[PDB]
Amino acid sequence: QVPSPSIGTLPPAPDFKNDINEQLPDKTNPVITHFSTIPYIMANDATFNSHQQIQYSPYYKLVRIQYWEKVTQRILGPRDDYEYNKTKGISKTDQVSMTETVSMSVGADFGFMFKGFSASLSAQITKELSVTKSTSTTEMTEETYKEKYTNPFNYELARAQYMLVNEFYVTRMDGTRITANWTLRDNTQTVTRIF
């Protein structure tokens, strides 16, 4: 039988458990949250030609994984500040792969850009993945930047921030990966934990 990805529920970001010193997990367990079936004419397959797609993979699966990445964690002394690295967006290789395999890319607004034949299925695919159609005219980059936090209180405070990470990948009808996982770090979706 044609396989079906197991859909999961993304749990809430890790939190503090009555401890100031508890190290919080760096990543949380990846959970398949969505997928969407696409015709073979949209999936340029590096090891499959037109003919064998038609008889062996007339459809492909576009899968969405989600998990929480720990952006940073730190204890701060009364009223102390500090800086940390924070990464947003999707890598350059990952955007070239997505555009070359399924004719898609991520725009500067975290939406999706649909190119070629892929444009006919935009409404289906944005719905089934629960992502939105981009209105941007430039592609998202990956950017690692510095972010400062100042402890506002006059007591010691642990603080950890988590970001929502997406991973996307395409798959033959029988389930064989034809790609690596394309990573998109959504910095508009962070959870902050203090104790």
| Chain residues in the site for its own copies (CB under 8 A) | 85, 87, 91-94, 141-144, 180-181, 183, 185
Q: Strand 157-172's sheet: what is its strand order?
A: 31-39, 59-76, 157-172, 182-194, 81-90, 142-150
In DSSP terms, 27 is beta-bridged to 69
Q: How far is the CB of 139 from its own copies (least distance, A)?
A: 9
The Cα 36–Cα 48 span in angstroms is 20
Q: How far is the CB of 144 from its own copies (least distance, A)?
A: 4
Q: Which is nearer to its own copies, 91 or 190 (CB)?
A: 91
Instruction: Quickly list DSSP for 63-99.
Output: EEEEEEEEEEEEEE-TT-EEEEEEEEEE-HHHHHHHH
Q: How far is the CB of 20 from its own copies (least distance, A)?
A: 26
The Cα 178–Cα 87 span in angstroms is 27
Q: How far is the CB of 141 from its own copies (least distance, A)?
A: 4
Q: Which is nearer to its own copies, 119 or 180 (CB)?
A: 180
Residue matched to tokens 């289906």: 124
Question: Which helix (H) or strand (E) segment is 126 a member of?
Answer: helix 122-129
The Cα 60–Cα 13 span in angstroms is 31
Q: How far is the CB of 90 from its own copies (least distance, A)?
A: 9
Q: Which is nearer to its own copies, 136 or 181 (CB)?
A: 181
